[PDB]
Design a protein around this nucleic acid. Sequence first.
DNA 1: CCTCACTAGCGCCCCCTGCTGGC
DNA 2: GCCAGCAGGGGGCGCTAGTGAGG
Length: 197
Amino acid sequence: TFQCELCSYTCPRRSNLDRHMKSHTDERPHKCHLCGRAFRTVTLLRNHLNTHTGTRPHKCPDCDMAFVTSGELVRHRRYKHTHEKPFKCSMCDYASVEVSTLKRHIRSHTGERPFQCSLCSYASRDTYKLKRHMRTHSGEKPYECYICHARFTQSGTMKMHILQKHTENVAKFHCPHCDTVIARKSDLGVHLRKQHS
DNA sequence: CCTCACTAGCGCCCCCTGCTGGC
DNA sequence: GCCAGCAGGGGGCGCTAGTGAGG
Ligand SMILES: [Zn+2]
Ligand SMILES: [Zn+2]
Ligand SMILES: [Zn+2]
Ligand SMILES: [Zn+2]
Ligand SMILES: [Zn+2]
Ligand SMILES: [Zn+2]
Ligand SMILES: [Zn+2]
């Protein structure tokens, strides 16, 4: 197996060996003229231009969605149609379509928190969770109620706001031990832990 | 072969749940 | 109790860089 030996990639085929030699250290000749980003191959530039125009030739045969590359169509079919989850956890029955999703799941088993907040002692298991946590320090409220124009730090909080304040005839919770009506299920949980041990 | 598949990976934002503490 | 704040385990897509067998 003739190999590059630089990173020691083993290649049974021939043309794939010379193609890998161009990925160790090569410039980016194919330059996009809209933005300032350049690419190595014509196909990478053609796909980049499709993202500029929204051209999606790979159409899903099971739904209306379409994608730029064939890989995005394959991953979509595993999420919404075939439900094929190739990456499985060795500690439980969990499985995911992508590797990083499984690694995020494994960190729930191990408790690894590698993303430390730079302003407090908090650390999260995911990059997004740290960014959502930063709103506590910045006071940012990105989500706005489309009815009363009230702002919230999370989208789920906004949806609960619309349910509890703008939705009519919402089924409320009744305490099984006393005649107390409670709107939110979690507030029923607090009431049960206070006046009922 | 140079085009399309499949893989590997980063990046990003939504979902739902359930608790907390000021009011 | 009402309420927004806030952290937890999750689904799913956007986009790029390599790779693998191919009419
Ligand atoms: Zn190599
Ligand atoms: Zn561009
Ligand atoms: Zn589909
Ligand atoms: Zn697991
Ligand atoms: Zn912090
Ligand atoms: Zn509102
Ligand atoms: Zn009660």
